[PDB]
Coordinates of C-alpha atoms in Angstrom, one line a residue:
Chain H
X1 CA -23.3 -4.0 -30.4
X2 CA -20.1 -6.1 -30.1
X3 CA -20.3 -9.3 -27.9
X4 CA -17.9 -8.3 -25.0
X5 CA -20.6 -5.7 -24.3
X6 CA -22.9 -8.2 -22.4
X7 CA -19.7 -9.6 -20.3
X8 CA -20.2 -8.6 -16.1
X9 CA -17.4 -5.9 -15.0
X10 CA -14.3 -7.3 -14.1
X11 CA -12.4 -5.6 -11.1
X12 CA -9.3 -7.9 -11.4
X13 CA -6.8 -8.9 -8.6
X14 CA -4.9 -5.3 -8.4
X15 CA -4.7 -3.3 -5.7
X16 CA -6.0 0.0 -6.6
X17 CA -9.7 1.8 -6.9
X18 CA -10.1 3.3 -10.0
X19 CA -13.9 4.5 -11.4
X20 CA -14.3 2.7 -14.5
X21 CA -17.9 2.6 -17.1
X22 CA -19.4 -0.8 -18.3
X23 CA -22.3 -1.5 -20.2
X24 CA -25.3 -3.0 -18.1
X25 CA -27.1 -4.5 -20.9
X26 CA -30.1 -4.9 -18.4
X27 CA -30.2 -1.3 -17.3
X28 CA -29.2 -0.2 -21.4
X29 CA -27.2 2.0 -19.9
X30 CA -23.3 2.1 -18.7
X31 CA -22.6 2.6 -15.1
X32 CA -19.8 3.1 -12.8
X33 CA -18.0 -0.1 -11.2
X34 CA -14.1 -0.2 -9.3
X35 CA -11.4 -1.7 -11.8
X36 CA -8.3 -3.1 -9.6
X37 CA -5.9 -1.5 -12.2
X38 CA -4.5 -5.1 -13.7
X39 CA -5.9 -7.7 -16.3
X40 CA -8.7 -5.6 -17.8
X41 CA -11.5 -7.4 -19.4
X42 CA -12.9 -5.4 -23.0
X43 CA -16.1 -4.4 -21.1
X44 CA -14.4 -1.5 -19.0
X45 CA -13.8 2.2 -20.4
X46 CA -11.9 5.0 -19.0
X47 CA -14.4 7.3 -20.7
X48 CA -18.3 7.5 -20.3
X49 CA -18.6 8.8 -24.0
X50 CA -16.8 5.7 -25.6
X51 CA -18.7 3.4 -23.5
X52 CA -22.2 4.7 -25.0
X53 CA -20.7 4.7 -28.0
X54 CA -19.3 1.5 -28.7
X55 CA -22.1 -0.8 -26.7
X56 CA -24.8 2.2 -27.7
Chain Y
X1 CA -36.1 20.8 -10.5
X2 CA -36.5 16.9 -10.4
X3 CA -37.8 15.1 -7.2
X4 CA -34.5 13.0 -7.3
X5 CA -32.0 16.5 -6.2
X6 CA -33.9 16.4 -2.6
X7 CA -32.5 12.6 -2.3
X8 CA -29.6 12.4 0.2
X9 CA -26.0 11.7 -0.8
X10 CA -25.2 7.7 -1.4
X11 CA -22.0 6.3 -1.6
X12 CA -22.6 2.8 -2.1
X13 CA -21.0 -0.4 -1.0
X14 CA -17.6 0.1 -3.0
X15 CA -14.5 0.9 -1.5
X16 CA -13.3 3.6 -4.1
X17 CA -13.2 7.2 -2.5
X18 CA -14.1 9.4 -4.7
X19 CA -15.6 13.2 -5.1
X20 CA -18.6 13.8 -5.9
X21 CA -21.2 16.4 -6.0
X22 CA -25.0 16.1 -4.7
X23 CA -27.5 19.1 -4.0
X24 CA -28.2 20.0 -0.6
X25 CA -31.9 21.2 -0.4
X26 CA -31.9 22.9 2.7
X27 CA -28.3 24.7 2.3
X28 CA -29.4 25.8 -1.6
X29 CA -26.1 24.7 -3.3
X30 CA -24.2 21.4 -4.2
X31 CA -21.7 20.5 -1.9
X32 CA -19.4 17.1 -2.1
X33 CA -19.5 13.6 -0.7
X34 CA -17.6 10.7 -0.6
X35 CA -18.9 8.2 -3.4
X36 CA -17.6 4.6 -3.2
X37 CA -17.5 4.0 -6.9
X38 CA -21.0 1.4 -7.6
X39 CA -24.5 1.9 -7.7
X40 CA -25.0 5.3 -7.7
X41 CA -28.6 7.2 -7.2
X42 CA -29.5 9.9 -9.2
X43 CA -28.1 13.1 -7.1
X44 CA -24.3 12.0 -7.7
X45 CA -23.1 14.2 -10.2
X46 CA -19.1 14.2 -11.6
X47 CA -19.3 18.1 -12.6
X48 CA -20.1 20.7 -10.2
X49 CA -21.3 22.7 -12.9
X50 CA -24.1 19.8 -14.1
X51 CA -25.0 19.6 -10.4
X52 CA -25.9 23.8 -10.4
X53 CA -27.5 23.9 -13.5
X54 CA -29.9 20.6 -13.1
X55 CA -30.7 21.1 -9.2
X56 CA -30.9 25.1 -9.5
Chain E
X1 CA -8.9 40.1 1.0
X2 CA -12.3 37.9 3.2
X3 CA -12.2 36.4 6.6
X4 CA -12.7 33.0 5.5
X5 CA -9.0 33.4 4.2
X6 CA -7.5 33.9 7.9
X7 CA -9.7 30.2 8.9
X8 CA -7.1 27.1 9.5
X9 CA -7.6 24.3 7.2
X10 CA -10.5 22.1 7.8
X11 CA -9.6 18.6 6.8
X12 CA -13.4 17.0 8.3
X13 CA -14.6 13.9 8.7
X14 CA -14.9 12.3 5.4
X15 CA -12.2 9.2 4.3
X16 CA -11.0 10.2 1.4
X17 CA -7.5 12.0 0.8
X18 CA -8.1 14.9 -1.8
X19 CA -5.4 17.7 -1.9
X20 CA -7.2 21.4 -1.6
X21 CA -5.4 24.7 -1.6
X22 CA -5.9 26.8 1.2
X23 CA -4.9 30.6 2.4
X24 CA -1.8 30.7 4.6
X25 CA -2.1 34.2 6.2
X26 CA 1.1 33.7 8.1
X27 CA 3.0 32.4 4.9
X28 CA 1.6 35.2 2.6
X29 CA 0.8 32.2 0.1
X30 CA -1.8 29.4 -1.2
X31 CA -0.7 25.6 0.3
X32 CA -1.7 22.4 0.0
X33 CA -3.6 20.1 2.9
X34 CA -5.5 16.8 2.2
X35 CA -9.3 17.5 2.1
X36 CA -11.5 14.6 3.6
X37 CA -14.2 14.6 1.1
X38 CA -17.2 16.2 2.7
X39 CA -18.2 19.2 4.7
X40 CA -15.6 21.5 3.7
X41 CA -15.4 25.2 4.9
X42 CA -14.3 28.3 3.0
X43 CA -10.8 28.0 2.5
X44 CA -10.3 25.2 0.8
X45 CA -9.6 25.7 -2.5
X46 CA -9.7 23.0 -6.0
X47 CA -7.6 25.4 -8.0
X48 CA -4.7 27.2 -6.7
X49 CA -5.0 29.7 -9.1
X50 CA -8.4 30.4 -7.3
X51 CA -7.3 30.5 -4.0
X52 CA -4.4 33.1 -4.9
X53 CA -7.0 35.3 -6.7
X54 CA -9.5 35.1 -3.8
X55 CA -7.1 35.4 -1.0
X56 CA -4.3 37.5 -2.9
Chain U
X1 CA 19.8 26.2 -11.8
X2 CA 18.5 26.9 -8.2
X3 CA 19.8 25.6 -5.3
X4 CA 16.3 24.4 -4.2
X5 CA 17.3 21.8 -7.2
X6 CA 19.4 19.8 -4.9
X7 CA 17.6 18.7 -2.2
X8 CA 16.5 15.5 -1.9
X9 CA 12.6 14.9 -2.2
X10 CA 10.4 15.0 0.3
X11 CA 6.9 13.3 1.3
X12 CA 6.2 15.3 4.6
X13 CA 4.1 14.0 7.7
X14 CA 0.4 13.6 5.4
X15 CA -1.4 10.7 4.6
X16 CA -2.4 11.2 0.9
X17 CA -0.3 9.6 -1.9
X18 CA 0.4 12.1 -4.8
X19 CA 2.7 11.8 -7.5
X20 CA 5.1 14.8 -7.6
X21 CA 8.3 15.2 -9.9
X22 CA 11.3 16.3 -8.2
X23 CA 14.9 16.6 -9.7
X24 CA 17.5 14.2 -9.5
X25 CA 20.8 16.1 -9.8
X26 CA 22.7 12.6 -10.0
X27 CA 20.7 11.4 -12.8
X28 CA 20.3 14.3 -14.5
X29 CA 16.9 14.6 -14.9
X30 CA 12.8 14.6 -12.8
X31 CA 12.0 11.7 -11.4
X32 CA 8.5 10.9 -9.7
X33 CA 8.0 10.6 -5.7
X34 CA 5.3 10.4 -3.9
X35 CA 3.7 13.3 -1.7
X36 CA 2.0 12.9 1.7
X37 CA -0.1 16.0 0.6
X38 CA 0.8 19.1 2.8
X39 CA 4.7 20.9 3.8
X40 CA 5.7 20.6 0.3
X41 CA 9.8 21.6 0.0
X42 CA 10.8 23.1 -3.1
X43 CA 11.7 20.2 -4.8
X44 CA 8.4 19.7 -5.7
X45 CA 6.8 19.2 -9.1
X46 CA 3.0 19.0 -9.9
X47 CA 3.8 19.4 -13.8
X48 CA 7.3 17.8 -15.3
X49 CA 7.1 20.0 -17.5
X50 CA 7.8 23.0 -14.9
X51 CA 10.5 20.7 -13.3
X52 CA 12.7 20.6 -16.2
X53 CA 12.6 24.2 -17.3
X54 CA 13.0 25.3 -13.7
X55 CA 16.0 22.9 -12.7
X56 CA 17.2 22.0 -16.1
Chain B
X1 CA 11.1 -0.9 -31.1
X2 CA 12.9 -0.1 -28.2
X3 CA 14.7 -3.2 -26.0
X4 CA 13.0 -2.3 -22.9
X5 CA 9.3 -2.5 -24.1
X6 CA 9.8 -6.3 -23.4
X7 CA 10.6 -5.8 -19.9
X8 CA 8.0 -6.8 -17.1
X9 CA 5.7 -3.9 -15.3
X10 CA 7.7 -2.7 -12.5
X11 CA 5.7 -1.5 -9.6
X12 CA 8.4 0.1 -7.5
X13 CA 8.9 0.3 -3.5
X14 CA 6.5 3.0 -3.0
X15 CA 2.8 3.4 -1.6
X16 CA 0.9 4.9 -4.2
X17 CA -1.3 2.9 -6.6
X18 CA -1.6 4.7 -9.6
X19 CA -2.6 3.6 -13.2
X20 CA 0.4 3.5 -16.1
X21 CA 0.8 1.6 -19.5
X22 CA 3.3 -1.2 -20.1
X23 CA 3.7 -2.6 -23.1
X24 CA 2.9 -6.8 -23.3
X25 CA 5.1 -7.7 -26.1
X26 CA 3.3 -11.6 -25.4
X27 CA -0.2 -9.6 -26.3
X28 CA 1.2 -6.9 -28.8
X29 CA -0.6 -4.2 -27.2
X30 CA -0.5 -1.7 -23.8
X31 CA -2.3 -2.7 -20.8
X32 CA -2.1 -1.2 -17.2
X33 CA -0.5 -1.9 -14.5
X34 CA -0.3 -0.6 -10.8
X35 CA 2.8 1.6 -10.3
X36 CA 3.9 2.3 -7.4
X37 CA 4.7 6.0 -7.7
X38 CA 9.4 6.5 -7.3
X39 CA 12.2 4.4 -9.1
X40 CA 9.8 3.7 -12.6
X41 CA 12.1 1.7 -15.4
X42 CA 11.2 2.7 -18.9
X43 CA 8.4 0.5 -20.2
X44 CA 6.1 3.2 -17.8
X45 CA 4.3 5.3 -19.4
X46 CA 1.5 8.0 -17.7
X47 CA -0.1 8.0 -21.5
X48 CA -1.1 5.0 -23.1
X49 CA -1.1 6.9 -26.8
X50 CA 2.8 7.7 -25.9
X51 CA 2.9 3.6 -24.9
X52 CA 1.7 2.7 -28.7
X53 CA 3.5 4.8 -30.7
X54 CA 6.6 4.6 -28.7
X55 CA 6.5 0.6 -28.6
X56 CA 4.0 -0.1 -31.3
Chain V
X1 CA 14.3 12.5 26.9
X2 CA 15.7 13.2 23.2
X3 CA 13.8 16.2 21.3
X4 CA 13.0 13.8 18.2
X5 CA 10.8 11.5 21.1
X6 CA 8.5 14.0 20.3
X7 CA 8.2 14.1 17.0
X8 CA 4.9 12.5 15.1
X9 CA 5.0 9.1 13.8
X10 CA 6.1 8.8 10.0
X11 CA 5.2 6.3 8.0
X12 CA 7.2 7.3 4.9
X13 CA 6.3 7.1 0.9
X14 CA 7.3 3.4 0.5
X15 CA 4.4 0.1 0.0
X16 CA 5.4 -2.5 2.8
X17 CA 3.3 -2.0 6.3
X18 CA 5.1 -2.7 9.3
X19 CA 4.5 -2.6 12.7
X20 CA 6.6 -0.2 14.4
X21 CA 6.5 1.4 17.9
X22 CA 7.0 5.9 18.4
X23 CA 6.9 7.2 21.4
X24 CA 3.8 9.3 22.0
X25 CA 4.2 12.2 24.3
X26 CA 0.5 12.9 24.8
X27 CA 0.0 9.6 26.3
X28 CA 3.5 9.1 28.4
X29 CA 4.4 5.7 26.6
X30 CA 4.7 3.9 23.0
X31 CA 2.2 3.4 20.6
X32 CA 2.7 1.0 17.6
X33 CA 1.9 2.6 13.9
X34 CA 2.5 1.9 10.6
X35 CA 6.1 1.9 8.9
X36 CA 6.1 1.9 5.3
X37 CA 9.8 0.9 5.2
X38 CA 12.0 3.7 3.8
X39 CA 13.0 6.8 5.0
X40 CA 12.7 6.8 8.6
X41 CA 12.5 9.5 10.8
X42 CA 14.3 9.1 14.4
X43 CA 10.9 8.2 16.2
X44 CA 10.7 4.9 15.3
X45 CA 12.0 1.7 17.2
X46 CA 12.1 -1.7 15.7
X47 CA 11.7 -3.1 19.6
X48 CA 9.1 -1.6 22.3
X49 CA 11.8 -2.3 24.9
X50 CA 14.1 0.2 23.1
X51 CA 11.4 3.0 22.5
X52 CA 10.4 2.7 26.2
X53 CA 14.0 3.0 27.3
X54 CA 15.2 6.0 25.0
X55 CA 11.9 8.1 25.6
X56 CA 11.4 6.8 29.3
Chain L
X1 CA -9.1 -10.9 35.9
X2 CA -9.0 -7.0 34.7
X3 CA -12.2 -5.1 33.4
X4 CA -10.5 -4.7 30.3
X5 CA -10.4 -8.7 29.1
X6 CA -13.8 -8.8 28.2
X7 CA -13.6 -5.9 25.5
X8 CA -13.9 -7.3 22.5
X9 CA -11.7 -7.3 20.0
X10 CA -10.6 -4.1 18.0
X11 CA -8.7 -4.2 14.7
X12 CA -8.6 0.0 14.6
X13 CA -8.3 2.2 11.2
X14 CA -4.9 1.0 10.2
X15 CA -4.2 -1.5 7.0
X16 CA -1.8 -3.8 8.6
X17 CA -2.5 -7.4 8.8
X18 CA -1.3 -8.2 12.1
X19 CA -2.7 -11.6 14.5
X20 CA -2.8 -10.8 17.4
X21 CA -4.6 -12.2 20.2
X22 CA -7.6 -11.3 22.8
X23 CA -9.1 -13.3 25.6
X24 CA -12.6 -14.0 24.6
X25 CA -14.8 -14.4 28.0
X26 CA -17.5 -16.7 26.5
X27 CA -14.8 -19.2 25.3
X28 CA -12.5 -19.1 28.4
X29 CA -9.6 -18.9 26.5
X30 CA -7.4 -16.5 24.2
X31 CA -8.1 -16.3 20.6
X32 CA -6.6 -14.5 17.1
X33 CA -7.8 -11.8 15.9
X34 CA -6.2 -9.3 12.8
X35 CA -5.4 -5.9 14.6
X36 CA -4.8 -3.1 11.6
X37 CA -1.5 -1.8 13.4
X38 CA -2.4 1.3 15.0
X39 CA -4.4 2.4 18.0
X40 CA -5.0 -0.8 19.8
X41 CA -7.3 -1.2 23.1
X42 CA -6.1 -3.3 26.0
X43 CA -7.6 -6.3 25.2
X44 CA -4.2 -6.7 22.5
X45 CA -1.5 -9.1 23.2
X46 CA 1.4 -9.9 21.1
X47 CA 2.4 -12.8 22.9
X48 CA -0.6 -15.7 23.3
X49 CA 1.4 -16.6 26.7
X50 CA 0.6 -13.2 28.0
X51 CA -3.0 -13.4 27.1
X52 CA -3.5 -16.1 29.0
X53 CA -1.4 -15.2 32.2
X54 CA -3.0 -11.7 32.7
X55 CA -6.5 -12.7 31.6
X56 CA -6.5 -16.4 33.2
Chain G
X1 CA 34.6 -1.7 2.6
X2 CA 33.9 -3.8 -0.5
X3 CA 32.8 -1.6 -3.4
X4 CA 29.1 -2.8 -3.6
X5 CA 28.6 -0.9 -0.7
X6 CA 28.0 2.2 -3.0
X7 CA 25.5 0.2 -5.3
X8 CA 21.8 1.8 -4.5
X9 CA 19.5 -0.4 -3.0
X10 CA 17.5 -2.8 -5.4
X11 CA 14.0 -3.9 -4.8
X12 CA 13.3 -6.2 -8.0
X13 CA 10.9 -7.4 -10.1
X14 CA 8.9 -9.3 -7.3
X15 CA 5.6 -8.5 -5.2
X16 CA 6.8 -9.7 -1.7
X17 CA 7.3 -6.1 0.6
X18 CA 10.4 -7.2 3.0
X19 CA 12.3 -4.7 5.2
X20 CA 15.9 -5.1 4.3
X21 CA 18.8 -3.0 5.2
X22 CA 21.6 -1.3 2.5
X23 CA 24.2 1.0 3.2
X24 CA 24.0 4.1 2.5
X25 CA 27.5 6.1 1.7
X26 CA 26.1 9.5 1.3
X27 CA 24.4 9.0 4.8
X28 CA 27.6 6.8 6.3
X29 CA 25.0 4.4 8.0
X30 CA 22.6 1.4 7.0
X31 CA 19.4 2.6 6.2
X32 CA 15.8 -0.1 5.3
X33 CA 14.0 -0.6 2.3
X34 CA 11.2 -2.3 0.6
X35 CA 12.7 -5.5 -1.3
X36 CA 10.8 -7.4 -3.7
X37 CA 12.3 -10.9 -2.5
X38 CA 13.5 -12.1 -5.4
X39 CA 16.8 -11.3 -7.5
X40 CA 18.7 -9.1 -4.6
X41 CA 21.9 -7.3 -5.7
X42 CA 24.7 -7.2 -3.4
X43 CA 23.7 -4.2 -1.0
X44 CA 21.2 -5.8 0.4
X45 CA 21.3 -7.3 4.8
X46 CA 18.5 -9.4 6.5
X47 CA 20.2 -8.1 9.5
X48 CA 21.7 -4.3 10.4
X49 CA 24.2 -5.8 12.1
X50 CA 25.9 -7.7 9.4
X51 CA 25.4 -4.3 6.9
X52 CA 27.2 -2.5 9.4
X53 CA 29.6 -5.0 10.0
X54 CA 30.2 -5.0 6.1
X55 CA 30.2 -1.8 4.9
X56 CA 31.7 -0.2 8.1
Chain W
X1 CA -3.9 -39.4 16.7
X2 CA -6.8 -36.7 17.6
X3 CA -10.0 -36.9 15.5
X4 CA -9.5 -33.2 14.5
X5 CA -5.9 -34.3 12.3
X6 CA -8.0 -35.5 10.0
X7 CA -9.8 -32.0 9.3
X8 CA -9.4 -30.0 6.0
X9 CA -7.5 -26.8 6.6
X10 CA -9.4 -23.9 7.1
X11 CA -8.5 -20.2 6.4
X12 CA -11.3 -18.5 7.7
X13 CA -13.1 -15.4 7.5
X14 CA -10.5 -13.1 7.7
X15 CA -7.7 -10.9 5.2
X16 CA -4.1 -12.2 7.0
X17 CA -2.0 -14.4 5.1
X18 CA -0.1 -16.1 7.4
X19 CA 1.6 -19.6 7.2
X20 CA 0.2 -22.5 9.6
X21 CA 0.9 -25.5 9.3
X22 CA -2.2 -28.6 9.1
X23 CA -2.1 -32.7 9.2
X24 CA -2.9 -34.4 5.6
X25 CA -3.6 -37.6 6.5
X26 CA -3.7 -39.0 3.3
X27 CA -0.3 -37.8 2.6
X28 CA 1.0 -38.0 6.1
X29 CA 2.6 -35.3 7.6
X30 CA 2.2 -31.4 8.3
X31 CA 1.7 -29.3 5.0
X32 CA 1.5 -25.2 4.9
X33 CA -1.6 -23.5 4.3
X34 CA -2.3 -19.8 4.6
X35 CA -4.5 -19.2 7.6
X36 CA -6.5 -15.6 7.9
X37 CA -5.9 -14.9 11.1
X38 CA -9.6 -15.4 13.0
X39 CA -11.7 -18.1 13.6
X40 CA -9.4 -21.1 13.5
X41 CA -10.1 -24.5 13.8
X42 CA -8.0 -27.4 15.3
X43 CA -5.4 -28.6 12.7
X44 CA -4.1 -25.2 12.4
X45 CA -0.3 -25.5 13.9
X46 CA 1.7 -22.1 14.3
X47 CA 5.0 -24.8 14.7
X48 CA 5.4 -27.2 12.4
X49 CA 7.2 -29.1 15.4
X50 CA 3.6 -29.0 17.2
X51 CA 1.8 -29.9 14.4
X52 CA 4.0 -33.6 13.5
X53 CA 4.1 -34.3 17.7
X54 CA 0.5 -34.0 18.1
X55 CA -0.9 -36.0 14.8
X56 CA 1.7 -37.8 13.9
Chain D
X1 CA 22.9 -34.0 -3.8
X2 CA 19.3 -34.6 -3.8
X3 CA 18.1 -34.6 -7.9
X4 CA 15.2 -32.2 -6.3
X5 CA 18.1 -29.1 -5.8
X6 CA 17.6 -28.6 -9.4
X7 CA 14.0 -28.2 -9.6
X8 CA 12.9 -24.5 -10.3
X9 CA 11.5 -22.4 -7.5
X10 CA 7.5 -23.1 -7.4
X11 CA 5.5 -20.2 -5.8
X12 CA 2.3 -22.3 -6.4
X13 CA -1.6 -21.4 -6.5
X14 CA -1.8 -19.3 -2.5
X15 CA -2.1 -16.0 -2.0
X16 CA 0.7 -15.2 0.5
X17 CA 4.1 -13.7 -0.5
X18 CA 6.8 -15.7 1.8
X19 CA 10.6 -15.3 1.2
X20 CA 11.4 -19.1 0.8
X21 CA 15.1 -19.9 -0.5
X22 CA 16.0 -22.8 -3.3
X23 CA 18.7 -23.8 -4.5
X24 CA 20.0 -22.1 -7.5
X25 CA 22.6 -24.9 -9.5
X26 CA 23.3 -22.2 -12.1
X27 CA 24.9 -19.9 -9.7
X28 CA 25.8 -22.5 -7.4
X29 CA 24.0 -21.0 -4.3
X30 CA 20.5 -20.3 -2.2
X31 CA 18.4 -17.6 -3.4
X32 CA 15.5 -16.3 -2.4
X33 CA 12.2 -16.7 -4.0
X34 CA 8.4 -15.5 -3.1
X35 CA 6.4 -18.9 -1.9
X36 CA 2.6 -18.2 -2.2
X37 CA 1.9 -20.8 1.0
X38 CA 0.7 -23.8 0.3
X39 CA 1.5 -27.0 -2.1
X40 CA 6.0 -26.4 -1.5
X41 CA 7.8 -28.4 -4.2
X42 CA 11.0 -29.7 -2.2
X43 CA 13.3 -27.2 -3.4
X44 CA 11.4 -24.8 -0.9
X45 CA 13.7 -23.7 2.4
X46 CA 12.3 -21.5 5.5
X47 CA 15.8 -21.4 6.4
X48 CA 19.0 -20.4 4.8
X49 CA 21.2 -22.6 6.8
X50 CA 18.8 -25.5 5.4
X51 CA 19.2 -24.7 2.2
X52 CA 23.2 -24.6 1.6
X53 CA 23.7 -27.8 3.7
X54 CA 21.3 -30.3 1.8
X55 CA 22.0 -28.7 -1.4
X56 CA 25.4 -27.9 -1.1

């Protein structure tokens, strides 16, 4: 499990409200959190699958 | 069928605006809701198909 | 062709802004109207191609 | 190429904000606008695909 | 690779505030950006896999 | 008192939200709404005075 | 001093970022306040020298 | 009337959302939209008066 | 000079970012500072005129 | 003129998005430029007429 994995998700200073998956290493699970649509940090996927899979 | 599908819908303190599907005891079918995009509870579901088939 | 189909499009009172198809008696055809998220009636439609088949 | 083609794009009185392709007969090609969600002209694209074939 | 994958993320006049892929010649990769949704420029691009090929 | 005083306010497809004044039949006087700043449609003054005085 | 000067302040649905200013009774005096551009109460003055002159 | 009056209005690079006036020869009359603030072509009036004026 | 010149500027509460103008004593004279738009405290000048006759 | 008229445009650290004009010796006039609202460099301009006069 790569080290960005245990990073906080990072909305960013855009506008919009897109659904985006992070990896709540204290749940050991990925949930849901609003990504601003700018400046993405590496904990944030677009799919639920790849997030499990990468910080699984 | 779980405890969790007779839960009522919860949107959350996001501001996304999103569809999603939670099961409605007394109608007998999933209908949709307005989820905000962040902490979730456990009768949210993406699919309308996963909401028929786990709250059926 | 149901009676649902001849029902005026309910928008409700939901926030979000979701386009659903719905049956246009006077028209003859499927259109679009923006869908509030929550407590929707019969004729509202996700696919078009299921609104046309329905209401055809 | 249909004379529907020609006309200019519009958004209509709604409140959502879809992106529709329309056709640009001064630049030759579809070009995205956005939609207010219901009155749709003709000039009005889900796929850009469809646009092209259609007014190409 | 194409001139215009160095220029700058163009948002555009309009409303909308949808997700696209610019390419950051600074970073060497595609990131998002907010676009607007009417008068895109070319480094735009509604796939990301079309973004890195096309610039890559 | 013009037909187009009766028309419903239009805010238009572009990003920028200014405050603009329609005249609202319903009520018997002008209302201020939201202008995104392109496209315009005839029910929409810049100045309250003017509104008042056109759909007086 | 009219009924409607101890309302208290409404910013209404709308996204604008508009000051605008109110009378606030318990103060004695007119104060800002961000109205959101659409459907405003009486207790709404564009001018601060107004505020005080009819709520005075 | 100077031949920039033909140009199509610019909005540039930048993130301001300013109400601007260019003239629009297809329409024969000044028409607003959404400027960036930064790097303005030629079509491009802080007041209608002067566009008309200009491109008259 | 007021004792309240001598205040830090204070944006407040609210999302508005408008431009008032504030005393810096240690530099001494009115700066810019973006104000929200509610709950303003005393070195908070909408003129900069204001602002350099009172604390200067 | 002032050596400052050939300092760049500073937008600086705020979050507002002001049309401020500088002087521009390259092209030998004002532009415009966003100013984010606080900490102005002194090639910074609310007015036009300001701008062309001491920098001209």
């Amino acid at each position: 499990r790569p080290d960005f994995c245990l990073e906080p998700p990072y909305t960013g200073p855009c506008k919009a409200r897109i659904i985006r998956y992070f990896y709540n290493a204290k749940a050991g699970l990925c949930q849901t959190f609003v990504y601003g649509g700018c400046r993405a940090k590496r904990n944030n996927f677009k799919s639920a699958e790849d997030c499990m899979r990468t910080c699984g």
